[PDB]
Amino acid sequence: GKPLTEVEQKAANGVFDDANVQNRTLSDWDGVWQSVYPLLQSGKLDPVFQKKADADKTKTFAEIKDYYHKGYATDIEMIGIEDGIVEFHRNNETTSCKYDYDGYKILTYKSGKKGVRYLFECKDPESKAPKYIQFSDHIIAPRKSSHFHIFMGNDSQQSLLNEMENWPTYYPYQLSSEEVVEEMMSH
Ligand code: NA
Ligand code: NA
Ligand code: NA
Ligand SMILES: [Zn+2]
Ligand SMILES: [Zn+2]
Ligand SMILES: [Zn+2]
């Protein structure tokens, strides 16, 4: 999409006022999405971790890698979103549901940076998909997503709000691996 404005870029970097946060519809995440965890597993994220580790004098390669290892770990390799339905692929198995939007929650991290979780819930008694999901993607108002983090669970939304360490990360499926690493190198 368009280059971000200064304000949007500050928002993407966790600086924004709560009054500027707006609701978003599920279609912002429409598409087919690939988990980045297999890139980590195959060693393809080594140069990202090397770059980050070289830049940060306070962190070693291992600490950076462990951080993203804990972050990206998931068995959900693919997520498809269309027509109000989210479908989750785990090995050869699929689940799906027509998710109902439930608003957003603004979180403040220890650093004082902030982030917005967009909440959805599955109320279809026949579905085996996660009852609760939350999207977080460095965007606080309607805009098609470039990559997203998703929190998935069956217990409560607060349970997912409490999750800070694991944030399964998804990029558009149409991107080649080189393209994904290229984007990651710039973050
Ligand atoms: Na299902
Ligand atoms: Na799941
Ligand atoms: Na992130
Ligand atoms: Zn370092
Ligand atoms: Zn991200
Ligand atoms: Zn992106």
Side-chain angles (χ1 to χ4, degrees), residues 1-45 47-91 93-109 111-177 180-187:
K2 297 295 212 109
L4 302 199
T5 67
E6 288 187 348
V7 166
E8 294 171 332
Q9 182 59 252
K10 292 187 75 207
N13 290 327
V15 175
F16 61 83
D17 278 350
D18 296 351
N20 294 96
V21 181
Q22 306 192 304
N23 287 290
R24 286 167 84 189
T25 64
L26 181 59
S27 60
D28 275 358
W29 297 278
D30 270 9
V32 188
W33 301 91
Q34 54 173 314
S35 179
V36 308
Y37 189 47
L39 290 172
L40 183 149
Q41 289 178 297
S42 73
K44 287 180 179 244
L45 302 189
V48 176
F49 300 147
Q50 298 237 341
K51 177 172 179 164
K52 290 184 179 283
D54 287 334
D56 187 339
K57 314 301 162 194
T58 79
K59 300 286 169 291
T60 60
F61 179 95
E63 296 169 335
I64 297 289
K65 184 172 178 213
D66 289 334
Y67 180 86
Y68 287 107
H69 190 164
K70 277 163 176 166
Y72 296 149
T74 190
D75 58 359
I76 298 199
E77 328 85 24
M78 180 188 273
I79 296 182
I81 303 173
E82 194 182 3
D83 294 328
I85 297 155
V86 184
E87 73 176 328
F88 305 88
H89 295 245
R90 170 193 294 157
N91 291 281
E93 305 178 21
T94 305
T95 59
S96 69
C97 183
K98 187 153 196 138
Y99 280 89
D100 297 316
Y101 184 64
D102 196 23
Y104 59 79
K105 296 286 190 189
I106 307 178
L107 302 181
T108 303
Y109 303 133
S111 62
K113 292 177 214 177
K114 290 153 59 161
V116 179
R117 304 280 183 94
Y118 288 92
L119 272 56
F120 295 82
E121 180 183 342
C122 180
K123 302 171 160 185
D124 171 8
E126 291 176 355
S127 174
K128 287 135 165 205
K131 187 178 291 195
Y132 307 106
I133 63 170
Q134 308 182 347
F135 294 90
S136 188
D137 66 354
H138 317 294
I139 295 169
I140 69 170
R143 184 188 175 96
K144 298 295 191 173
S145 182
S146 308
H147 81 259
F148 71 75
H149 308 276
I150 189 168
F151 302 83
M152 297 167 284
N154 289 308
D155 300 330
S156 68
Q157 297 286 15
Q158 182 64 49
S159 179
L160 302 180
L161 296 180
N162 291 351
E163 179 61 63
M164 296 286 193
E165 194 144 17
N166 180 235
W167 15 267
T169 297
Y170 295 84
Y171 272 79
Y173 182 87
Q174 47 268 47
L175 299 184
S176 65
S177 52
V180 177
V181 175
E182 198 64 5
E183 290 207 49
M184 302 180 78
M185 289 285 292
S186 73
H187 297 158

mmCIF file with all atom_site columns, all heavy atoms in Angstrom, residues 68 72 138 147 149 167 169, ligand 3:
data_model
loop_
_atom_site.group_PDB
_atom_site.id
_atom_site.type_symbol
_atom_site.label_atom_id
_atom_site.label_alt_id
_atom_site.label_comp_id
_atom_site.label_asym_id
_atom_site.label_entity_id
_atom_site.label_seq_id
_atom_site.pdbx_PDB_ins_code
_atom_site.Cartn_x
_atom_site.Cartn_y
_atom_site.Cartn_z
_atom_site.occupancy
_atom_site.B_iso_or_equiv
_atom_site.pdbx_formal_charge
_atom_site.auth_seq_id
_atom_site.auth_comp_id
_atom_site.auth_asym_id
_atom_site.auth_atom_id
_atom_site.pdbx_PDB_model_num
ATOM   1  N  N   . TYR A 1 68  ? 12.688 -14.862 18.878 1.00 0.00 ? 68  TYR A N   1
ATOM   2  C  CA  . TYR A 1 68  ? 11.855 -15.097 17.702 1.00 0.00 ? 68  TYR A CA  1
ATOM   3  C  C   . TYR A 1 68  ? 11.399 -16.538 17.591 1.00 0.00 ? 68  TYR A C   1
ATOM   4  O  O   . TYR A 1 68  ? 10.344 -16.814 17.003 1.00 0.00 ? 68  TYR A O   1
ATOM   5  C  CB  . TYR A 1 68  ? 12.556 -14.621 16.438 1.00 0.00 ? 68  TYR A CB  1
ATOM   6  C  CG  . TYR A 1 68  ? 12.565 -13.120 16.380 1.00 0.00 ? 68  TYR A CG  1
ATOM   7  C  CD1 . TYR A 1 68  ? 13.728 -12.393 16.594 1.00 0.00 ? 68  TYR A CD1 1
ATOM   8  C  CD2 . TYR A 1 68  ? 11.388 -12.414 16.136 1.00 0.00 ? 68  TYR A CD2 1
ATOM   9  C  CE1 . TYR A 1 68  ? 13.706 -11.005 16.566 1.00 0.00 ? 68  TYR A CE1 1
ATOM   10 C  CE2 . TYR A 1 68  ? 11.376 -11.052 16.083 1.00 0.00 ? 68  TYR A CE2 1
ATOM   11 C  CZ  . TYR A 1 68  ? 12.525 -10.346 16.311 1.00 0.00 ? 68  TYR A CZ  1
ATOM   12 O  OH  . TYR A 1 68  ? 12.468 -8.980  16.279 1.00 0.00 ? 68  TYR A OH  1
ATOM   13 N  N   . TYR A 1 72  ? 7.555  -17.085 17.105 1.00 0.00 ? 72  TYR A N   1
ATOM   14 C  CA  . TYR A 1 72  ? 7.005  -17.595 15.850 1.00 0.00 ? 72  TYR A CA  1
ATOM   15 C  C   . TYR A 1 72  ? 6.476  -19.014 15.956 1.00 0.00 ? 72  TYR A C   1
ATOM   16 O  O   . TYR A 1 72  ? 5.692  -19.423 15.112 1.00 0.00 ? 72  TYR A O   1
ATOM   17 C  CB  . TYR A 1 72  ? 8.026  -17.549 14.744 1.00 0.00 ? 72  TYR A CB  1
ATOM   18 C  CG  . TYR A 1 72  ? 8.497  -16.170 14.344 1.00 0.00 ? 72  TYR A CG  1
ATOM   19 C  CD1 . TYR A 1 72  ? 9.785  -15.979 13.867 1.00 0.00 ? 72  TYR A CD1 1
ATOM   20 C  CD2 . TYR A 1 72  ? 7.647  -15.072 14.371 1.00 0.00 ? 72  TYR A CD2 1
ATOM   21 C  CE1 . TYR A 1 72  ? 10.232 -14.736 13.476 1.00 0.00 ? 72  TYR A CE1 1
ATOM   22 C  CE2 . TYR A 1 72  ? 8.084  -13.831 13.987 1.00 0.00 ? 72  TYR A CE2 1
ATOM   23 C  CZ  . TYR A 1 72  ? 9.362  -13.658 13.535 1.00 0.00 ? 72  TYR A CZ  1
ATOM   24 O  OH  . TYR A 1 72  ? 9.777  -12.405 13.140 1.00 0.00 ? 72  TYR A OH  1
ATOM   25 N  N   . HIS A 1 138 ? 0.401  -3.937  13.802 1.00 0.00 ? 138 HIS A N   1
ATOM   26 C  CA  . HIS A 1 138 ? 1.107  -2.644  13.767 1.00 0.00 ? 138 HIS A CA  1
ATOM   27 C  C   . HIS A 1 138 ? 0.299  -1.583  13.033 1.00 0.00 ? 138 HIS A C   1
ATOM   28 O  O   . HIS A 1 138 ? 0.824  -0.585  12.532 1.00 0.00 ? 138 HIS A O   1
ATOM   29 C  CB  . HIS A 1 138 ? 2.484  -2.822  13.138 1.00 0.00 ? 138 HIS A CB  1
ATOM   30 C  CG  . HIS A 1 138 ? 3.200  -4.045  13.607 1.00 0.00 ? 138 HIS A CG  1
ATOM   31 N  ND1 . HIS A 1 138 ? 3.617  -4.207  14.911 1.00 0.00 ? 138 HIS A ND1 1
ATOM   32 C  CD2 . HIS A 1 138 ? 3.574  -5.170  12.949 1.00 0.00 ? 138 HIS A CD2 1
ATOM   33 C  CE1 . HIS A 1 138 ? 4.234  -5.373  15.033 1.00 0.00 ? 138 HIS A CE1 1
ATOM   34 N  NE2 . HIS A 1 138 ? 4.220  -5.979  13.856 1.00 0.00 ? 138 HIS A NE2 1
ATOM   35 N  N   . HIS A 1 147 ? 1.445  -8.062  7.188  1.00 0.00 ? 147 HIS A N   1
ATOM   36 C  CA  . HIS A 1 147 ? 1.770  -9.312  7.885  1.00 0.00 ? 147 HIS A CA  1
ATOM   37 C  C   . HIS A 1 147 ? 1.052  -9.183  9.213  1.00 0.00 ? 147 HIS A C   1
ATOM   38 O  O   . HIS A 1 147 ? 0.759  -8.065  9.656  1.00 0.00 ? 147 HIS A O   1
ATOM   39 C  CB  . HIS A 1 147 ? 3.298  -9.524  8.081  1.00 0.00 ? 147 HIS A CB  1
ATOM   40 C  CG  . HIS A 1 147 ? 3.880  -8.768  9.244  1.00 0.00 ? 147 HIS A CG  1
ATOM   41 N  ND1 . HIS A 1 147 ? 4.577  -7.577  9.111  1.00 0.00 ? 147 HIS A ND1 1
ATOM   42 C  CD2 . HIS A 1 147 ? 3.867  -9.047  10.569 1.00 0.00 ? 147 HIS A CD2 1
ATOM   43 C  CE1 . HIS A 1 147 ? 4.947  -7.160  10.304 1.00 0.00 ? 147 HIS A CE1 1
ATOM   44 N  NE2 . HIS A 1 147 ? 4.507  -8.018  11.207 1.00 0.00 ? 147 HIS A NE2 1
ATOM   45 N  N   . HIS A 1 149 ? 0.193  -10.866 13.366 1.00 0.00 ? 149 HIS A N   1
ATOM   46 C  CA  . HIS A 1 149 ? 0.362  -11.771 14.466 1.00 0.00 ? 149 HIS A CA  1
ATOM   47 C  C   . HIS A 1 149 ? -1.014 -12.143 14.956 1.00 0.00 ? 149 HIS A C   1
ATOM   48 O  O   . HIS A 1 149 ? -1.887 -11.277 15.059 1.00 0.00 ? 149 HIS A O   1
ATOM   49 C  CB  . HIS A 1 149 ? 1.148  -11.037 15.536 1.00 0.00 ? 149 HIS A CB  1
ATOM   50 C  CG  . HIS A 1 149 ? 2.408  -10.442 15.006 1.00 0.00 ? 149 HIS A CG  1
ATOM   51 N  ND1 . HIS A 1 149 ? 3.576  -11.168 14.877 1.00 0.00 ? 149 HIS A ND1 1
ATOM   52 C  CD2 . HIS A 1 149 ? 2.691  -9.193  14.558 1.00 0.00 ? 149 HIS A CD2 1
ATOM   53 C  CE1 . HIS A 1 149 ? 4.512  -10.398 14.350 1.00 0.00 ? 149 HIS A CE1 1
ATOM   54 N  NE2 . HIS A 1 149 ? 3.996  -9.203  14.124 1.00 0.00 ? 149 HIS A NE2 1
ATOM   55 N  N   . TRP A 1 167 ? 3.613  -15.208 19.403 1.00 0.00 ? 167 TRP A N   1
ATOM   56 C  CA  . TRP A 1 167 ? 2.805  -14.395 18.504 1.00 0.00 ? 167 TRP A CA  1
ATOM   57 C  C   . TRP A 1 167 ? 2.982  -14.901 17.060 1.00 0.00 ? 167 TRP A C   1
ATOM   58 O  O   . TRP A 1 167 ? 3.625  -14.260 16.240 1.00 0.00 ? 167 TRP A O   1
ATOM   59 C  CB  . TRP A 1 167 ? 3.176  -12.903 18.665 1.00 0.00 ? 167 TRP A CB  1
ATOM   60 C  CG  . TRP A 1 167 ? 4.460  -12.636 19.401 1.00 0.00 ? 167 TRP A CG  1
ATOM   61 C  CD1 . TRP A 1 167 ? 4.608  -12.405 20.742 1.00 0.00 ? 167 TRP A CD1 1
ATOM   62 C  CD2 . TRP A 1 167 ? 5.773  -12.560 18.837 1.00 0.00 ? 167 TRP A CD2 1
ATOM   63 N  NE1 . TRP A 1 167 ? 5.955  -12.187 21.058 1.00 0.00 ? 167 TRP A NE1 1
ATOM   64 C  CE2 . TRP A 1 167 ? 6.683  -12.264 19.896 1.00 0.00 ? 167 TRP A CE2 1
ATOM   65 C  CE3 . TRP A 1 167 ? 6.272  -12.694 17.541 1.00 0.00 ? 167 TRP A CE3 1
ATOM   66 C  CZ2 . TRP A 1 167 ? 8.050  -12.134 19.678 1.00 0.00 ? 167 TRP A CZ2 1
ATOM   67 C  CZ3 . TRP A 1 167 ? 7.625  -12.551 17.332 1.00 0.00 ? 167 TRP A CZ3 1
ATOM   68 C  CH2 . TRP A 1 167 ? 8.503  -12.288 18.390 1.00 0.00 ? 167 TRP A CH2 1
ATOM   69 N  N   . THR A 1 169 ? 3.253  -15.629 13.403 1.00 0.00 ? 169 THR A N   1
ATOM   70 C  CA  . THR A 1 169 ? 3.385  -14.529 12.479 1.00 0.00 ? 169 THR A CA  1
ATOM   71 C  C   . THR A 1 169 ? 3.178  -15.011 11.046 1.00 0.00 ? 169 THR A C   1
ATOM   72 O  O   . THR A 1 169 ? 3.754  -16.018 10.638 1.00 0.00 ? 169 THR A O   1
ATOM   73 C  CB  . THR A 1 169 ? 4.760  -13.897 12.642 1.00 0.00 ? 169 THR A CB  1
ATOM   74 O  OG1 . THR A 1 169 ? 4.859  -13.362 13.975 1.00 0.00 ? 169 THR A OG1 1
ATOM   75 C  CG2 . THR A 1 169 ? 4.978  -12.771 11.670 1.00 0.00 ? 169 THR A CG2 1
HETATM 76 NA NA  . NA  B 2 .   ? 6.189  -7.720  15.287 1.00 0.00 ? 3   NA  B NA  1
#
